[PDB]
Design a protein around this ligand. Structure first.
Ligand SMILES: CC(C)C[C@H](CNC(=O)Cc1c[nH]cn1)Cc1ccc2c(c1C(=O)O)OCO2
Ligand SMILES: CC(C)C[C@H](CNC(=O)Cc1c[nH]cn1)Cc1ccc2c(c1C(=O)O)OCO2
Ligand SMILES: [Cl-]
Ligand SMILES: [Cl-]
Lengths: 148, 149
């Protein structure tokens, strides 16, 4: 479980928000992209895997699962690509709830940021810092425990 | 020390590579940008602070230290902005050495990536995973975990 991440793609203001969730902790990383292509997803995963020990990724849809560029990035970074099928159906609800929460935070920071990308990063910050421990605290503890 | 980061700006292929180094561990995050503006630096810090517990940042130069946008981002994120003056002069050598190492890795991945930004992220990966023995990635997690307890 310490190396398991889930991809999540949500939409806002005619733009695409790509999210990676560390399943065990609820910690996230996110980016705004023009559209969800294999290339954008692949680049996002390369960034993620350089920053955290990503062992397995549950991909968000079949197009990214199939993408040769995504497969290339997973090979390069030592990531096992898996499907994101919610065999446990409560999975979908948790993700949907997070997307709602994230959009809510984004709305709350609109007097502060001119650009959506900035608001998304503010939302990442607030999500990861929210307290009981925070998601940021949980991911560090989970990984540290795993190293030692 | 667990919350202390240093900004570092280096140049390659007529482009700018902005780097944040976690001082105690040597762990890095980096991005390619067209040029080093206050706005780009500010955005970079917002990203960083959402991902790791950034308490203090030693800024890479006076323009970013002065920048109202950088100051706004540091205020927003709860970051103490400090200067990056190497009072301990060995500081500067360590950074220069890392920049050399990073450029070397970037050169080694040029048959693999079409775009510089991709090569930089590959270099971040290799740097953070490299065993010295623990890796920088392992060190930062241990340092922060120890601090939470
Ligand atoms: C830290 C924030 C509180 C402020 C900081 C600067 N923005 C403003 O001051 C806009 C404003 C607020 N009230 C009236 N105008 C946000 C920011 C930082 C860096 C960026 C940005 C933005 C952005 O605005 O999206 O865009 C890409 O690089
Ligand atoms: C995982 C890598 C080994 C490959 C992957 C795809 N690139 C190629 O296949 C180029 C090629 C042709 N012949 C040899 N290499 C890199 C990559 C991924 C995502 C991106 C990229 C790039 C990039 O190339 O910069 O640009 C922005 O989004
Ligand atoms: Cl790592
Ligand atoms: Cl954090």
């Amino acid at each position: 479980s310490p190396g398991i991440w889930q991809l999540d793609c949500t939409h806002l203001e005619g733009k695409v928000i790509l999210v990676a969730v560390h399943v065990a902790s609820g910690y996230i990383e996110a980016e705004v992209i023009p559209a969800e292509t294999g290339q954008e997803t692949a680049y996002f995963l390369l960034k993620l895997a350089g920053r955290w020990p990503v062992k397995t990724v549950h991909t968000d849809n079949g197009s990214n699962f199939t993408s040769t560029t995504v497969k290339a990035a997973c090979w390069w970074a030592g990531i096992k690509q898996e499907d994101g099928i919610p065999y446990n159906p409560q999975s979908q609800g948790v993700i949907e709830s997070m997307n709602k929460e994230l959009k809510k935070i984004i709305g709350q920071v609109r007097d502060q940021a001119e650009h959506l990308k900035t608001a998304v990063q503010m939302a990442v910050f607030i999500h990861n810092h929210k307290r009981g421990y925070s998601a940021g605290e949980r991911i560090v503890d989970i990984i540290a425990t795993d190293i030692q």
